[model samples]
Target: MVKKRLAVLVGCNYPNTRNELHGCINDVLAMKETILSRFGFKQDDIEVLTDEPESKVKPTGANIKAALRRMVDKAQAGSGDILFFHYSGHGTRIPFKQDEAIVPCDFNLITDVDFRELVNQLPKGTSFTMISDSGHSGGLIDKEKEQIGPSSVSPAIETTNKTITSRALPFKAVLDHLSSLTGITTSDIGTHLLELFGRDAGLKFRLPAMDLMDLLETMTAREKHVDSGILMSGCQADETSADVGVGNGKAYGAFSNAIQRVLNENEGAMKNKQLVMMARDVLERLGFHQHPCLYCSDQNADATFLSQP
Candidate 1:
């Protein structure tokens, strides 16, 4: 049987607002072409979601999650199918729990725990590769083993640009934005989120229906050796990812650009570990302080990126 290939690419620009991004849509469009041309993904098998007004499918939090679910459901067990998800947008952390989350165009947050849940549902032999080009994305998948981080590699000391554009949206700003929309003002952001999005709110803010043992079993999957999730994050959990040239028209995420640059300069297939390391070096040379990270099992680090079945 021929292996199936699928991908969901999301980009959020938040246009006409203070948090507007210039390069997120560009990143998604470029990656769509790259995957189709270089990764052997069929045209009909790929999904593109953006916040542009003309976009048929908007990259709202609920829509993004649904798109992922569709992809996961379409993958078959023992089929060796390949799956890919790429996110380019602002990311933030919950103030109290400090849980990392990617900000949707509509301000609905998708937390790391949600991603872990998604990863756990993948069928055996299916490879799910995720590229998160957002701030605080290093730990996007909860409890994944860290292959390259501060403990493993020494960061270069370099400084440039006293003020930089980061992709992290502050929690306070999130609350303010929601309050203005819902007319619900409170210190607890959950109240506003629930009021506006209700059932579509992220699980991180809402109480989970799972019992204690169920939760334990979810966490226990990390201890087992059967993980198929691979994450390539733009920056560490504590650091911010750079958004360069926002107002000057030609804008893009530094990390996403670096990945494309490395791929453009190479010919043969590159290992997952090599891609992260090279992207980190590319950012460092460009005076970016954020470090890219890889999270997966030991075997995946050495596996070829988006390998063919």
Candidate 2:
């Protein structure tokens, strides 16, 4: 059997903003490494995009689009490739004339119609796994429970030991550093950083656009046959996701840390159901009341793959 290819794109830290949406960059990198080391994927088969790199931090919108285009190009050339795309940032919904638009930090609110256009760009027959760890993350939270009005107070005070803080990369600092090295404005470089350095700076870059819905629908449908893919989102459609504080000077968004724990620790040992259970258990133990949501055609999807030797 032929091995599959995987690609990852992580967006963290917006320029001119204090929000470190990229806190989950490490989580995605950890997943990429785990997938390559524990699963049968070659070094060249994986790609990651993050905001720490000056090349990507500036001109964020264009860089994201370029990254998506690259991934779609790869999918078109390789058959049976398993493509993984992870985004950790702010998610917003804009009111359109007829429907609501779901938007990421890189773009202003984008319409659901626009979102589908970007999703349509991905190649067909690819098993794609998309994990988003930011905003409106109610998908992970149980909905049937009675809503507690703002006046309701809990007797137990939530502890702070496990909460992760989300921090943005110092965009100006990175720009200065890159400018010194390349003599080019941070806004000028494209995907050339990935092509030139190849994972040296710990930044994985990608492009952003309005075609997400179409790409997701196509990949979800194709992966259904083998029962081999999953879409784990941070929250549901109505609720806003949180940015939390963690360890000394390090921060992580709630959903980002939860997903990382699942992939890094569970590997192939747990099935889809077990994975969900374990993830929820960890979150609760960490004092997070919100539960992550898992969407897939197969409830019994294989959660592991043998590492390449």
Candidate 3:
């Protein structure tokens, strides 16, 4: 059996910064191991760009574009092969020539027009799967916020010898807070979050622009037996994914941990639904209640394994 091709872009620990972009790096590493060990992909078949060794600290826009370009160039059409893309980092938005744009750490804000351009870049009938652990809802904190002095704030109130106020809220809490501030109803928050994050980060929020059901229909319409793709996002477009401090002096975002658990706990043989179920289970165990949304075209495709062409 032909093997699948996978490309991963992990943006953690910005250049000249100490922030732990854990989810991005962790998920990428986990996926890399999964594709190589479980799915039997050769090292050359999987391209991994991550923050490792102190020198690999920069996660620039040019880097992301170059990575995507490489994937588009290498992927084959109508080959029953699978192509996977994973992005984990801060997501932002900026003003574009016409409308707003979603920008990622690479400094490229992908507009709807840009997404269409990217979609065209892929060879026809190529199976594509994208997993993003970054938040879509303005979760990109202001640079100034990052600079705030922790000492400026009062210490958390102690309750039962624990730092009560220091405890961070779950991912849903962050999402709810974003929704409340944006005046977006909880039901419609996902789309708005998508609009903000997708436009800024250069991704296409297919579920919102086209109804989830319709998008799946289109994705599965081609003649080639291309296994449909799957997108497991962190939250509905409207909610923010929270950043929690980790014990190792690193902070793991909610989505990142979920993705990690999905890959880490399964011993590398987990399918799509299995991964989704695992992600949901992990999130819930961490006190998160938001249901993860899954979108795909392959009706009978096994979500438990990577699509190996």
The lDDT leader among the candidates is 1
Location of the lowest summed lDDT over 10 successive residues in candidate 3: 141-150
All models, RMSD in angstroms: 2.2, 10.3, 11.9
- lDDT digits (tens) for residues 144-227 of candidate 1: 788888776756557755345788988898889888989877998878888888888877666654653476486676449568
Model 1 misplaced stretches (Cα beyond 4 Å): 155-164, 208-213
Clash statistics: count for each candidate: 0, 40, 23
lDDT tens digits by residue: candidate 2, 1-309: 464665656655553454544355555566666666665567776556565545434324345445545666665533655666666665543223222222333332223333233444445445555566755433221111112212211343375465444222232433344455556554633233343334321111223323534545554564434333345556544544556753333556676666567767754455544555566667667766555555544432444322112
Question: What are the lDDT scores of the predictions, listed in order?
Answer: 0.85, 0.47, 0.48
TM-score of 3: 0.59
Deviation (Å) of 85 in candidate 3:
1.4
Can you write out model 3's per-residue Cα lDDT over 1-309, one digit (the tens) per residue? 453565654544343332334445655666677667766667876656565556353454446556666766767755655667666655433332222223344333443334334444566556556655554421121110111112221222222221111112233443454465457765543455554455333344434546644544554353244334445555533443444554344555566567766666656455565666577667666666433444444442354546522
Model 2 TM-score relative to the real fold:
0.59
Query: What lDDT is reached at residue 118 by model 1?
Result: 85
Error of 1 at 282 (Å): 0.6
Select the stronger candidate by lDDT from 2 and 3: 3
By TM-score, how accurate is candidate 1?
0.93
